[PDB]
Amino acid sequence: PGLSCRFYQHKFPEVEDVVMVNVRSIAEMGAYVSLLEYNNIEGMILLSELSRRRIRSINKLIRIGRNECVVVIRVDKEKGYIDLSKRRVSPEEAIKCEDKFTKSKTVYSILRHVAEVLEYTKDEQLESLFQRTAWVFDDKYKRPGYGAYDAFKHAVSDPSILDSLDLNEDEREVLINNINRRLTPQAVKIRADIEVACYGYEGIDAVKEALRAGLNCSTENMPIKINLIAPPRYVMTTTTLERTEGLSVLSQAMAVIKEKIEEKRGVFNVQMEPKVVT
Amino acid sequence: AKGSELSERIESFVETLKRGGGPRSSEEMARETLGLLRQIITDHRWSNAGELMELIRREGRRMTAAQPSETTVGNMVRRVLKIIREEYGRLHGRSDESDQQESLHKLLTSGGLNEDFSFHYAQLQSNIIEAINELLVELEGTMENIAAQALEHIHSNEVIMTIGFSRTVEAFLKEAARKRKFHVIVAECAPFCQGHEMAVNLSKAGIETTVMTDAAIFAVMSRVNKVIIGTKTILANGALRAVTGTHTLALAAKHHSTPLIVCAPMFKLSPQFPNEEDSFHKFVAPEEVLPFTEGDILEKVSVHCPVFDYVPPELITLFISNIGGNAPSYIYRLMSELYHPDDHVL
Amino acid sequence: GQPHLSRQDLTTLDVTKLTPLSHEVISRQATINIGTIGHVAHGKSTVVKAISGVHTVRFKNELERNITIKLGYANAKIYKLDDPSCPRPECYRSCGSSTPDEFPTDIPGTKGNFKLVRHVSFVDCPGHDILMATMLNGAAVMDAALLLIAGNESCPQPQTSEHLAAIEIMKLKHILILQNKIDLVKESQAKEQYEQILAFVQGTVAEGAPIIPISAQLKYNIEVVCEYIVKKIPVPPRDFTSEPRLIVIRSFDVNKPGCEVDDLKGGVAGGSILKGVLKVGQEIEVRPGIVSKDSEGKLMCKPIFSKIVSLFAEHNDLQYAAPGGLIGVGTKIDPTLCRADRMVGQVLGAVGALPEIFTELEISYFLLRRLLGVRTEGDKKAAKVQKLSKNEVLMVNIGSLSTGGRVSAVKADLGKIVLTNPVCTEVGEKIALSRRVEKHWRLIGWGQIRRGVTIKPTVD
Amino acid sequence: EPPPPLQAVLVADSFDRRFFPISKDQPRVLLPLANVALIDYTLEFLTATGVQETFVFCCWKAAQIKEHLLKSKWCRPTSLNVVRIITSELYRSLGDVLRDVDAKALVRSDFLLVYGDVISNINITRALEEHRLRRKLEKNVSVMTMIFKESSPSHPTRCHEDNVVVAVDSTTNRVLHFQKTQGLRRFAFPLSLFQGSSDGVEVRYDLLDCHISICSPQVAQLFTDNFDYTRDDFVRGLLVNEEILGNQIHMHVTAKEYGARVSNLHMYSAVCADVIRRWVYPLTPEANFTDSTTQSCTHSRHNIYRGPEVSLGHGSILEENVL
């Protein structure tokens, strides 16, 4: 149901700590927002701390319902006042905050789905689950947010991390299932279209030899497949969970094919460069 | 990488401006121009603010000459130029700004200005990019800000007349219709009968709407309480470059003393006065007015199809923008705090 | 390479011993050509279908080019029953080319296994391109004929005179007449039709020819046709000793879309063999090969050198190919050059044993003046053949080698023809001419290649 | 399987003497219409319609055409339309050009066939989509889609030389009969048109020939097969020989867009008058679509375009439609 929990261990942020907020209301002193990473606690983006230049209306830069990256400038745990500034947030800090929030939200979604599977009904159960799994990694790596996501990524390919936890059998099984379902990297297909033709005496033999020479430049974990589209146009297709080295390997496979075919007095051309096909 | 992509994107933008433009709105035009100028600032190599301003002006001249009737591109170029000037003056030790930039009696009496953009500051680029990002953020909400003032200008059972299809006016009316009941009369704005679409959308929102040709504007104006229109450009004296037939509507409203409200955002304000330049109207092919199937009759008949109409400021009652309501007599001030006089002619 | 047929061995092969009646060659491929000079809607295709069964064609293109010009071939094996008890012509039987050399009798002819006798190929064209295909070059296009007259109509039909004129111009001495569609014909009607036929062919080449009445649809008296093929048709003389030559008629790209690299094949070129024997693994040259233009637009030709990967005759696989049918040479040429019949009009032969490549010809033409065997109904000028004019596109048909040509100059009877594409030929060869009268190409004369502009084949 | 980038075959030679003796010293495609060469108009139309590769075939005065093209806007590296110039002295007709196209295997999919004297602002995307859909539904049946413009028979842009009458199956926009009405007073239509379609056999005389075609490579294949073939010969032969080969020709009619061919001086005058009066917008004299510094002008009232450094004498009157 309405189960919610803080993304991190500490209940309140600190000064000079970029956080993600959601604008909820407009007031006189500033914009009343909710801190997304801290179970939607109230905060205020000050009107003075909104822009370096003079600003006439708060609605010029603030829209209700839009997420923002703001730096905390004042915390009062007693009164419950958190003051946020948008002027002091650098674009690089905004990108870092966005990435951290994305990772933390992924971890929170995984844990919330686990709790829903376990039919958890109270926020205390979710807090305990966060205590057992996520915050243990967070304070083991001394990196809030990043540590839990990195440890979860270390799973799937290595479930040996998820045995020191004090989870139950059902908890461990559901956590493993959810992490593998929502965190396993997918496979992207890289495709290129080339032209190979030999007008010499060798003919089809030269083209076949060059195609096989470029075909043997395939890593065991990454297959390379070459098929005829319609002569002299052929297609090279590969499927790899990770893309950059696949593009590179198709690139110098094309290079070696071109070298071999031009060695045998052939003609080579590239119709379409390697590209990730959906 | 940098140049090979930036020049290609500039060429694509210029070519799109020259031939067509697609379904792109004014907000999209401004956003794309701002992105282009931001990438020009980031990628191109400029030592001081003077070189950057010269390069921006050089690109803006081409972008404007691509399609003179699209004034949003020039408005955004001049806004970026003013932003560069403001940032440089802030880093050059001039304390308050946006007042000494404009010629003023008080400034003239108590001194003056001696501009010099030769100095180099390493933090200029970051400040300029931050200002451009703020401008884009403001663009993302200008339409909502305009629409939020709907209930302050419409009363119960009011008859509102509009011409053409304006997305800003459509959002304004739809926001007003949530809490109020009123009757809208839309002129079709021939030959491009966009008003028809404007009447369909307003009909989908439950607003009692009526369609009529541009010939019935004066006949129906006697029973119209308010006129709400969009615009393509707001000139430096408060005049309008609106769709064709808007001058007739404004005259009809002035005859009956019906208020005329222009719902236009801030980026549509252009510092160009309507002196002349012979580049005001945009004459599309006469196929829209007289079909090609007319025959030999077309070899001795001069057919003209202007798209835009010039509305003098005397016929305009109020301007509703993202910053609120203003009279046409205050537009000059909105010029001075948005554009620099030295940047009027790119 | 296929079972139940006579073994072919290159090592145990001699060109001099080869004859058109050789059992090894006949067992796999046809050796003689019998063109069927008939007409559509009269059983021209039905007769061939009944004689040779139904073909499937090993390789076919998705688009058929020059369907009204293509010289179609149909192979048929004719066998004789060795048992003297079985009466003729029931001992003679026609069947397909995929049958084994011997099969047991399927009739109560008191035992006796059938034995292969001959293998024939039917040169059938949808029109009359046969006429100028074989009318002066001669070569080995065919050595027999099958003149077909239907029975429902009365001889001579307006579609018969052109057939007889064709039979005369081809200089064919061996013609067999098959009266088709006589099943729904009374005996008196058939007798009077035969009388009209003999009156029409009186004083012509078809004087001493059989008038055999057959029914193609019901397969009646086909054995008589086989018997007269065996006996009346003599064995043609063929030259198996010279260097092989093949005129390319078809061309296929056999690689299906989405095939593996190891499954790629070369270009299969179908064609007709004139003189010689082709062997698997033999080096071959195709001329003019790749024809291209310079930057300024100057023609240049690079002959294509390759090796014979395999040989096909309809559904049979061969080791050596001899004249007398449509042979498909599968080679090592890239499929790009041999896709969608793009190599038609080229000569494939032994290396260094090919004629010269010509771009223009200077021919001594004798122009015909009325279309051969045409009834001039109403419009007297329709059948008249106008004189050659400048910038007129004809159809030069050197044997089975078809090529266009624009007449550039005519002095008295020496016409210069600028071919659309360079072709391989030799000075002094007999060529023919055609002109687009309406919806068709019709023969209008013939000539000799007095001179011609040749192009030097560049070799890298 | 996305189709390859759209290609165009531009024929820079008219292969006739319709502009004699003006063509003795200047190719037709280089004649200035409103101070802009005709080939520039055709290249601008091709680039605007979305053509990425253009093959310009020049035979007569090919050196001048190449020299003009190399300095043009479309031979710059920044152009999205790559112009490749093919020249040969053995070109005598459009049939030769298409036979060479087939021999070089230049085109793999549907391409645009236009002459170098076609002035148009037509967007071919709709017609191209219809052509591709027709070829997908019926495999290798429809081979060509001609572009026509609705017009009255009395319009000045309809000379008697190029006037055509088309019998069309209106249900599928399929051309059943195509005829030229030059020197005729009574148009004859064979009854064979009224064989299958018992409802729509519309006889249209209101179609102006834009001389723009969307052609599959089968067009080049058929031109190679029938070596005696201009485009009109191809159309007539295809319509007559529909029994032997099941090929078809369809048509697309545009009403809101302009398209014409400058094939004679009368058509030149008509097209120039239409261009000056903005009938081919946005190809207007002030738009400077050629991106040349010497061909820029300002558009005042009454369609009066004035260039830079133009001196007007006192008392001079420019009435209307003056560039």
Side-chain angles (χ1 to χ4, degrees), chain C residues 423-434:
Chain C
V423 303
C424 264
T425 194
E426 44 104 13
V427 165
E429 207 146 3
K430 291 300 192 284
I431 81 170
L433 309 175
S434 296

Side-chain angles (χ1 to χ4, degrees), chain D residues 35-108:
Chain D
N35 299 343
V36 169
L38 303 173
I39 198 163
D40 288 341
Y41 280 98
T42 321
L43 279 175
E44 184 53 80
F45 150 70
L46 287 175
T47 305
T49 206
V51 156
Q52 305 197 50
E53 196 172 19
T54 300
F55 302 103
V56 183
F57 285 84
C58 330
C59 173
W60 174 253
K61 304 210 174 316
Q64 290 189 226
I65 297 166
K66 192 176 185 73
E67 175 55 45
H68 164 83
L69 278 192
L70 287 187
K71 323 178 304 183
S72 95
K73 187 194 76 166
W74 303 270
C75 274
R76 301 192 193 138
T78 76
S79 71
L80 296 188
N81 192 22
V82 202
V83 168
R84 297 170 205 290
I85 308 167
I86 297 107
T87 165
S88 161
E89 308 89 7
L90 311 183
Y91 292 154
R92 332 189 89 253
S93 63
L94 188 150
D96 297 311
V97 168
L98 255 60
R99 274 168 229 120
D100 216 356
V101 161
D102 192 42
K104 299 164 175 281
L106 293 182
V107 283
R108 303 200 283 100

Side-chain angles (χ1 to χ4, degrees), chain B residues 97-154:
Chain B
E97 292 178 83
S98 303
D99 56 346
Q100 91 276 354
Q101 298 300 90
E102 67 222 17
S103 277
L104 154 55
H105 227 184
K106 212 212 73 43
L107 178 82
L108 207 154
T109 274
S110 71
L113 243 191
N114 282 301
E115 70 277 351
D116 184 18
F117 297 86
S118 296
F119 291 76
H120 158 90
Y121 300 84
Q123 51 296 31
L124 201 85
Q125 170 163 343
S126 57
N127 294 14
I128 290 167
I129 300 303
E130 175 184 293
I132 293 186
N133 295 349
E134 283 180 14
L135 208 59
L136 287 156
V137 166
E138 166 189 293
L139 280 207
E140 310 328 345
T142 173
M143 159 98 64
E144 185 170 304
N145 283 351
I146 293 180
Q149 314 178 49
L151 285 179
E152 313 173 12
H153 298 94
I154 286 173

Side-chain angles (χ1 to χ4, degrees), chain C residues 15-30:
Chain C
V15 291
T16 60
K17 195 258 321 166
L18 281 175
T19 52
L21 280 192
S22 295
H23 190 274
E24 44 260 82
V25 179
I26 291 196
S27 169
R28 296 203 166 264
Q29 53 149 111

Side-chain angles (χ1 to χ4, degrees), chain A residues 259-278:
Chain A
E259 162 190 355
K260 185 54 68 55
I261 194 67
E262 288 179 316
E263 178 259 344
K264 269 173 170 181
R265 304 273 57 64
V267 81
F268 185 84
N269 204 8
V270 192
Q271 306 329 347
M272 149 189 114
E273 293 277 351
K275 182 257 316 170
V276 174
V277 56
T278 62

Side-chain angles (χ1 to χ4, degrees), chain D residues 256-315:
Chain D
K256 293 290 126 216
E257 287 159 318
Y258 187 93
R261 193 198 166 198
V262 176
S263 49
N264 48 71
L265 263 180
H266 167 253
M267 287 288 320
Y268 171 90
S269 168
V271 167
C272 194
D274 280 347
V275 156
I276 282 306
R277 295 176 309 168
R278 310 193 145 263
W279 280 95
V280 206
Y281 180 87
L283 296 198
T284 59
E286 101 263 17
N288 201 10
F289 62 94
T290 40
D291 219 316
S292 146
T293 78
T294 62
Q295 284 167 10
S296 62
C297 56
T298 72
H299 168 231
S300 314
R301 208 179 221 94
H302 297 123
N303 280 322
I304 289 164
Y305 307 86
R306 186 209 265 248
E309 274 68 69
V310 171
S311 69
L312 212 73
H314 165 269

